[PDB]
Amino acid sequence: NGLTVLPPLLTDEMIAQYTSALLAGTITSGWTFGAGPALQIPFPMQMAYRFNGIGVTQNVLYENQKLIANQFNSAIGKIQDSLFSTPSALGKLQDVVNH
Amino acid sequence: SNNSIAIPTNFTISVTTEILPVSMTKTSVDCTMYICGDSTECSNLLLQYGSFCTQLKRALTGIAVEQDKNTQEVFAQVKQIYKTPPIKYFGGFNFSQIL
Amino acid sequence: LQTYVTQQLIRAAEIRASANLAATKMSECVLGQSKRVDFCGKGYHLMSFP
Amino acid sequence: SNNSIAIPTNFTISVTTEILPVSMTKTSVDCTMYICGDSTECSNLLLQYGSFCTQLKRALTGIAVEQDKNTQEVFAQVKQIYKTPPIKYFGGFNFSQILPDPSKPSKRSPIEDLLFNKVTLQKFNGLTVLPPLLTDEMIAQYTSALLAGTITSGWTFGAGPALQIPFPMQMAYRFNGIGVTQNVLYENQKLIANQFNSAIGKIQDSLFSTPSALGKLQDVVNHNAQALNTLVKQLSSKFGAISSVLNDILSRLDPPEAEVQIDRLITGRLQSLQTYVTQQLIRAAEIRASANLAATKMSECVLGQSKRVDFCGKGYHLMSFPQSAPHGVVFLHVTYVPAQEKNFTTAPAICHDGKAHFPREGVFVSNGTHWFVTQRNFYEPQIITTDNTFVSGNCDVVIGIVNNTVYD
Amino acid sequence: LPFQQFGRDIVDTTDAVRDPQTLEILDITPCSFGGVSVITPGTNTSNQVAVLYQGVNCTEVSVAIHADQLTPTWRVYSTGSNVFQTRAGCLIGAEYVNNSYECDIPIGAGICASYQTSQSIIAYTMSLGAENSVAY
Numbered sequence A: 001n002g003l004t005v006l007p008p009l010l011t012d013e014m015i016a017q018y019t020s021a022l023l024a025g026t027i028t029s030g031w032t033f034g035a036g037p038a039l040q041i042p043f044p045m046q047m048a049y050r051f052n053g054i055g056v057t058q059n060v061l062y063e064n065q066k067l068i069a070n071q072f073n074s075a076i077g078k079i080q081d082s083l084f085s086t087p088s089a090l091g092k093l094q095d096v097v098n099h
Numbered sequence B: 001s002n003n004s005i006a007i008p009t010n011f012t013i014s015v016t017t018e019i020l021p022v023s024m025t026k027t028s029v030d031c032t033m034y035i036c037g038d039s040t041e042c043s044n045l046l047l048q049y050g051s052f053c054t055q056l057k058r059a060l061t062g063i064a065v066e067q068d069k070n071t072q073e074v075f076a077q078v079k080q081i082y083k084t085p086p087i088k089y090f091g092g093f094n095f096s097q098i099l
Numbered sequence C: 001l002q003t004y005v006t007q008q009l010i011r012a013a014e015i016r017a018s019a020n021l022a023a024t025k026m027s028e029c030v031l032g033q034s035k036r037v038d039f040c041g042k043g044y045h046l047m048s049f050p
Numbered sequence D: 001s002n003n004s005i006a007i008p009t010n011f012t013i014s015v016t017t018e019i020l021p022v023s024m025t026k027t028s029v030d031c032t033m034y035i036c037g038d039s040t041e042c043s044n045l046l047l048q049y050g051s052f053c054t055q056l057k058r059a060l061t062g063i064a065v066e067q068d069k070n071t072q073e074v075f076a077q078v079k080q081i082y083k084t085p086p087i088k089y090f091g092g093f094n095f096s097q098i099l100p101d102p103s104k105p106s107k108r109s110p111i112e113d114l115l116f117n118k119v120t121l122q123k124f125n126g127l128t129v130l131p132p133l134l135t136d137e138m139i140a141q142y143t144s145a146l147l148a149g150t151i152t153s154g155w156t157f158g159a160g161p162a163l164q165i166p167f168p169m170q171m172a173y174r175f176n177g178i179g180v181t182q183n184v185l186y187e188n189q190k191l192i193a194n195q196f197n198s199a200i201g202k203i204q205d206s207l208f209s210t211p212s213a214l215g216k217l218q219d220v221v222n223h224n225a226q227a228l229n230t231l232v233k234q235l236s237s238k239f240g241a242i243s244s245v246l247n248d249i250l251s252r253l254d255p256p257e258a259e260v261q262i263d264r265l266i267t268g269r270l271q272s273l274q275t276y277v278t279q280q281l282i283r284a285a286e287i288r289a290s291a292n293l294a295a296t297k298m299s300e301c302v303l304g305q306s307k308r309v310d311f312c313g314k315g316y317h318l319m320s321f322p323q324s325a326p327h328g329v330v331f332l333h334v335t336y337v338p339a340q341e342k343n344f345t346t347a348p349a350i351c352h353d354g355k356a357h358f359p360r361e362g363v364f365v366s367n368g369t370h371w372f373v374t375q376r377n378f379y380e381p382q383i384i385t386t387d388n389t390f391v392s393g394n395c396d397v398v399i400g401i402v403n404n405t406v407y408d
Numbered sequence E: 001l002p003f004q005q006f007g008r009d010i011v012d013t014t015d016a017v018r019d020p021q022t023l024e025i026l027d028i029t030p031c032s033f034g035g036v037s038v039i040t041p042g043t044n045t046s047n048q049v050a051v052l053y054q055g056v057n058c059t060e061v062s063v064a065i066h067a068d069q070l071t072p073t074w075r076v077y078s079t080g081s082n083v084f085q086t087r088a089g090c091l092i093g094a095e096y097v098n099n100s101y102e103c104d105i106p107i108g109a110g111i112c113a114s115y116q117t118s119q120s121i122i123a124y125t126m127s128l129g130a131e132n133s134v135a136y
């Protein structure tokens, strides 16, 4: 009756490219690419840096590398299942559409 | 007690989620097609109510422009599109669920 | 019409508050390590993924 | 790669800007003058509508008081009023572009002067504009006090009594804060001073050439002007009556017939005021959020060093300086950016005599033949002694451990 | 041009006319108006008040006091140190000292009023703060 809806400037494919860029930069560089040029560093050393940041010495990580890696992988597998089960998990995003 | 303490001897890794809205739907509305439609007589009567609809158009257009700005500020943080190496070994960590 | 437009203006201000908070969490939890308690999760923060 | 690291060998000092609105225009309204005027017949019909007008005056008055609290919350961060020393020598650093110049009568810095020459670009119907409580000269005194306190004291004046300290030592403290040892600054004091001075000079030309630099402060000036013009032009709309003049229809019309005509004009003009007041309330809320953010940046970037990423400028924060603009404030963020990286080969630990060795504060690195330990933000190799490593373990569990010699 | 009658501004309000008797162009300016404020201390303390005429010159008010103003609630008169002109309006009923204290009752562009000790209402200039200088 005189009402129109306009499409967003960024398509849903373009947005997903930005998220891929952030993931690739935070895996191979850490927090270096947020300040200046991206700098190489192996991943376990980044986790040692982060244990130092939270206040635990480096040797804790290196002597428990396998245990921590298994815990990280298992903890992210449950993310999918918790999303399948609960249908009201995305209440906030669904609330915007209905309003 | 003033001579006792508790110190942890083990740890665990946990992953949590957080959902945040960013933008909403962009709409535009036309007065004459809505209030009157195609009736010319109604258009003349609506004409002599000052500049109400000029205000409605400007109000709704300002909202539409902001919706593109919100997504630009959240995702478009880095100006370099990084790419992950073809081989996906990261010291035992498994990122296959998010890449 | 005026009632509809006025409601949208108030809603948009609420969205900006959420969008600004999201843009802050990306700078401090994703592009760095945050020492603010309970800002980027419960516990001692390590990293984040969007 | 899982055995390759990159480490910078040089840096760069950069200065950016940030513009934030702090307050907008204060206004007042008068019902009877705007709606009826000098017509006594109209004012008798208006009082049948009750206390609509008392609500409108309350709404605008509340906004006006809030504007004065927005300015007081940003600049009035200092109890004292510090003054710059008579001799302007700070170990090679130049501050002539930000400190006030006595030659100008208003005592405003050269950067502050050109800001006032760009954004700067009686009554009608009882709509009046009230003046802000704090004058422009008073605001610049607050800014000068903040600048003179962060130069001769650092961050100590933001927590209690102000304690003086030489400027290079303050910069060494801030380098320690960002994570680079003191000896880097002292051995490169002359070069760092030259880099900072060049960055300041580009600020003046950056604002000269760029037209859309002060675009955020310009919008609030034009938005408040448009609303008043739209409000005044609504006085010449028929709204469905014979004419748009009160006494013109008063004369050539039947006295009961003219009663319903005045009703249309009054209802139309009441609706115009409701639209204006409601619009200002929403805009005032948006400005208040901006003023609250500017108060946080003043307390966290100017009176101290912040470790929040991307909060006080891109890079690693060092310090900040405030500048005053009409209806706003401008920040000058000084940051530290690495440059000139290089390939390297790294290992997690060093094995010697059956014992593992981890660095204290550094990362192990090899140039091809010899292994060194260096800080993780500036290439500065050192010999691997026992005063920079701790054994803490055995040479059997760590993955990727290499073995070398450690000189005790 | 010798066919037009009256002029209009941007907001479509008459601001110039032409006399029909003798062809001459006249300007039109509205008669002065503005808000009125009352400055009082606690009524539990005293009964004196000070009046502020927002956005108007002091000479215009004094001239119009001669039975030509639409507010009979007038002050006593220009008894020497009562008429002080500020950037906000013609303040009547307060004496302007040349000292400086912290603000107590905001008035306008850097001017405040307070009840200081006989007893009277005084207007001064707001003091930013206690001065200091660090020996660098």
Ligand SMILES: *[C@@H]1O[C@H](CO)[C@@H](O[C@@H]2O[C@H](CO)[C@@H](O)[C@H](O)[C@H]2NC(C)=O)[C@H](O)[C@H]1NC(C)=O
Binding pocket: A070, A071, B009, B010, B011, B012
């Ligand atoms: C610290 O906790 C971890 C798990 O949180 C323990 O690892 C578990 O050990 C038991 C016994 O060998 C196994 O059955 C589990 O499968 C292990 N967990 C995982 C995820 O593999 C570890 O033993 C604890 N350490 C101490 C010293 O108590």
Ligand SMILES: *[C@@H]1O[C@H](CO)[C@@H](O[C@@H]2O[C@H](CO)[C@@H](O)[C@H](O)[C@H]2NC(C)=O)[C@H](O)[C@H]1NC(C)=O
Binding pocket: B094, B095, B096
């Ligand atoms: C990372 O995790 C994924 C998800 O579990 C692994 O992919 C699974 O591998 C098993 C074993 O071959 C299969 O039975 C599953 O079907 C796979 N999942 C899917 C969705 O196909 C993957 O192997 C892990 N990464 C590595 C290097 O092992």
Ligand SMILES: *[C@@H]1O[C@H](CO)[C@@H](O[C@@H]2O[C@H](CO)[C@@H](O)[C@H](O)[C@H]2NC(C)=O)[C@H](O)[C@H]1NC(C)=O
Binding pocket: D009, D010, D011, D191, D194
């Ligand atoms: C780090 O970078 C600075 C910035 O270019 C270098 O300073 C220049 O050095 C060259 C050669 O020594 C001089 O010709 C230039 O005049 C210097 N520029 C300035 C602005 O002074 C510095 O040499 C670099 N340091 C290293 C170790 O490479």
Ligand SMILES: *[C@@H]1O[C@H](CO)[C@@H](O[C@@H]2O[C@H](CO)[C@@H](O)[C@H](O)[C@H]2NC(C)=O)[C@H](O)[C@H]1NC(C)=O
Binding pocket: D094, D095, D096
């Ligand atoms: C700090 O920088 C200013 C700006 O460059 C210097 O002032 C300049 O000095 C040179 C040398 O006399 C003159 O040629 C310029 O005309 C000056 N510019 C201005 C805008 O006055 C100032 O000398 C520097 N401070 C010190 C101590 O040298």
Ligand SMILES: *[C@@H]1O[C@H](CO)[C@@H](O)[C@H](O)[C@H]1NC(C)=O
Binding pocket: B087, B088, B089, D001, D002
């Ligand atoms: C990790 O190191 C091993 C040698 O221990 C090497 O074979 C492998 O290629 C490395 N990973 C990558 C991704 O290059």
Ligand SMILES: *[C@@H]1O[C@H](CO)[C@@H](O)[C@H](O)[C@H]1NC(C)=O
Binding pocket: D340, D341, D342, D343
């Ligand atoms: C580091 O090594 C990579 C691998 O080839 C190379 O592309 C890069 O240019 C090197 N870095 C520098 C600063 O030369």
Ligand SMILES: *[C@@H]1O[C@H](CO)[C@@H](O)[C@H](O)[C@H]1NC(C)=O
Binding pocket: D367, D368, D369, D370
């Ligand atoms: C690597 O470091 C050693 C130790 O000083 C040095 O002798 C050698 O020349 C260096 N190699 C290169 C290519 O500079």
Ligand SMILES: *[C@@H]1O[C@H](CO)[C@@H](O)[C@H](O)[C@H]1NC(C)=O
Binding pocket: D402, D403
């Ligand atoms: C030292 O390291 C080499 C290879 O990294 C290994 O072959 C050798 O056995 C190590 N030394 C000892 C004493 O184990």
Ligand SMILES: *[C@@H]1O[C@H](CO)[C@@H](O)[C@H](O)[C@H]1NC(C)=O
Binding pocket: E021, E022
């Ligand atoms: C009207 O009469 C006056 C009388 O002084 C005269 O000056 C004027 O010229 C007359 N109007 C015209 C248009 O001549």
Ligand SMILES: *[C@@H]1O[C@H](CO)[C@@H](O)[C@H](O)[C@H]1NC(C)=O
Binding pocket: E057, E058, E059
């Ligand atoms: C007020 O009137 C006096 C004398 O008429 C004049 O000197 C002064 O400039 C006037 N003030 C303003 C603001 O016009």
Ligand SMILES: *[C@@H]1O[C@H](CO)[C@@H](O)[C@H](O)[C@H]1NC(C)=O
Binding pocket: E098
């Ligand atoms: C107040 O003192 C100042 C500075 O001495 C002076 O200029 C001013 O005339 C004084 N006010 C008077 C005397 O009313």
